[PDB]
Amino acid sequence: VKNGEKWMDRYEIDSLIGKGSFGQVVKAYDRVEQEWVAIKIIKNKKAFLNQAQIEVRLLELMNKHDTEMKYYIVHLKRHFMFRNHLCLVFEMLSYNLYDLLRNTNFRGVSLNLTRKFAQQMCTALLFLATPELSIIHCDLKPENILLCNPKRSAIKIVDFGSSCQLGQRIYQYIQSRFYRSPEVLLGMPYDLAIDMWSLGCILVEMHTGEPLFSGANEVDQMNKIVEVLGIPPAHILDQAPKARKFFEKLPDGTWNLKKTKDREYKPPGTRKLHNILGVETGGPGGRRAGESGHTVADYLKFKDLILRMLDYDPKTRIQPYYALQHSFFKK
Template sequence: MTPYAKDYGPQFQQPTPRGFDRHDLRSSILSSNLPSPSLRHEIFDSSLESPYPSHNSLTVSHQCLDKQSDTWAGRKQEKMPNWNEFYKNGLPREIIVIEDTPEPSQHAPNAPTSGYHLIQAPVPQSSASKKRKIDHITTPQEPYERAKEEVRNHLPSAPTGKSGYLDTLLSGPQAQTRSSGEVAQPNSGQKRKRTRLQLEAEPSAILGTAAPAIGGYPGLSGPVIRSKDVAVRIGHTASTYSARKIDDDDGHYIVVPETNLTSQYQIKKLLGQGTFGKVVQAYDYRRNELVAVKVIRSVQKYRDAAKIELRVLQTLRQNDAENKYRCIHLRDCFDFYGHTCIVMDLLDSSLFDFLKGNSFVPFPNSHIQSFAKQLLTSVAFLHDLGLIHTDLKPENILLRDASYQTFTYNRVVPSSRTTPSRQAPQRRVLLSTDIRLIDFGSATFQDEYHSSVVSTRHYRAPEIILGLGWSFPCDIWSIGCILVEFFTGDALFQTHDNLEHLAMMETVLDSRVDMDLVRQVNKMANRGNGAASYFKRLKLCYPTAETTRGSRRFVRTLKKLDEIIPPTNGFMRSFLDLLQHMFVYDPARRITAKQALCHPWFQEQVCDDGTEAAKLAPGRAHLTQHHKRAQL
């Protein structure tokens, strides 16, 4: 059972409660030979909506600026250059801009950037007083159109009849171009060196601009409201509970049903427990309804982490009061004898728990499509706020109502492996696909500190494994993994080893890790990046002498992506194409949430068990309300 799950009656039986950690089914796979049941990210610019990086056919030499550095001030008065002539050979890889900002102290610690979180190289003693900064500029219409054509040659082919998809993504109001000298600034007042990728990764939220409606996502209606530290009220008195022990030896709150958490909440039962603390179901006396309360451990590091989570939750609520974007909202918070308590809506089981209770038989295609659109909308909203979730997985996607109808299945279950497939006689089909995104304990603001490793292993993006820093694109990779899992019922990359994980990616995607990324890894080898040892001559060193026979077999039996998602019809071809755009090694070329919402897959219609189950939902709604009232 997930942290915010609730129980209805036997008629609405829910999946069996489980712990917070995903059960590792790999050992049974290896022993049984059966498959496991288990825009380039850029500053949003209304003048340019190209989702992919500029063509790298021209690189501007540093000498172009150094040659006349003594007359730089005078050059500002010259007329605007002929950009059509400048871009006649294609778009430049980088544009160098000289700033009058003093060079930061070379002894200053590496600070997080407002784009990709990359480690800064030490500044030489003889560095000039002027600072170089790499900027992405908007080009005129002619080179833009040429670049758009070149992008087509770098991407997987669009499905037949869907060529308009790339045109939609690459088109935009180019006439309203941004000034070539304009440089977007982060919220932080400190100026830092930023690479081209860092600038491209920054969302419109950092600039405070509103995005246009895209793929049903209306975007922000105004500037981002970022919450400061949330005030946590004291919810206890000195005499309360003085007669009994409150905490165990690890700082976890000792849950006792029918006892009070302040005068407003009464604990009903324990819902789940993790390293952060416990989640309980409680009754809210004031609102006369059940809620979920996350009780943080009385350990300082977890209390500090709770402050960040409260900031994120408050930011979500302030920018989406009506909860159009399906993220869990903060209802209340208080301190109870050293335990930070976060009150949220009580939801139903997670999508992982539903899969588990369904013997890992996958969801209907119509439900996968619905989940994908809701999830991408939520993530697009987060990214517009300058937030990266960093821990997207089925466990963190909760259903509002997990009521289901059982349908006859009697078919082979899709699998990501070539070993003998399994069959299922029936499957549970949800009556409603309404979901909420939860667990913002690891969510990170783009311009704040980035830890080196994020994401649950199975959903971790390659740039994180390679130690190249991460930003908004890591959430998109996770969504791709989630969608494949919804289609097959089992996790795509079931591993706990970095080298094996990369080998699995190469097998599934049928392509090697991009050489440019490997070169970046090699350049960072002298700064403690151990990922350089995974490669030799720009190729992945797998298998090695230490690789186990089980690992070799596990990687060898993985299917390619177009075998896992066979393009047998228009729906499947579009689904495969969307996944191919999500599973791009280079995060700067990976599709964004907004672009994904424009994909033609969301226009495909499908009739299956999911659409039939939806017809039964209205007749069951009053029964659900009856069970809710009975619980109270």
């Protein structure tokens, strides 16, 4: 595909926006609606297609509801088949929250702009919790969240390439390693709560500039989580099929971390979030200090809400509705 190309008397190709594992996305001009659109083209094999067909069904299912909460999700306009390649057409958006982080030289955005991103994102999760919908994203992270307009702070979610309805699971190795939840590490079955774990991890990083849990492999990842939150509740490890990839059971019935050939890893639960945020010490690297809106009383409300998102037990973890009513959002 090259600049100039006309497709079936309607779409005029301009350029490549993005690559992917699924195929290519492009910038084209529609002559019926007379507006610019983004076209995502699937690679021509039996494998990507079948998943794509699911992506389309899940998007259409969402277009049918018309609530005040569906406006935090990218809008799908059309789909059609051409030169044996499934093609999806969406509205144009701006750059993503990773580029944004990279333009601060990884120093982070304000608490006040962090709050505005969290509010919008808790709303989108509450929309997918609609009983007649019940959708799990399975791949939340900065790259998959886009600004609506480069002048403004409105956002929307994209890439429903891994998504699945409650009780329709295909794979067990899902999510991006940095944003993977403890139940998926322990090979247990998953519901909607895994997307709320990812949000916690994302929000911390948008204020500090660096990831919360940056593992180089599955064993590395779990150890950087025990550093902050300690050993998980016994009742959970006793059901988890891959609990002995990370821990050991004792005669009385208590668990501990496994052996390892030693220059890293602090003791369980001693890397308190308290210092990762710099609550009583003027923010990350005390870079705020002078700055107004970054008072100690506002920092404790952020700390409390993050720690409700990083509960090990997914039955007792906080849900979209109750998070929108937290003291951190109160005026």
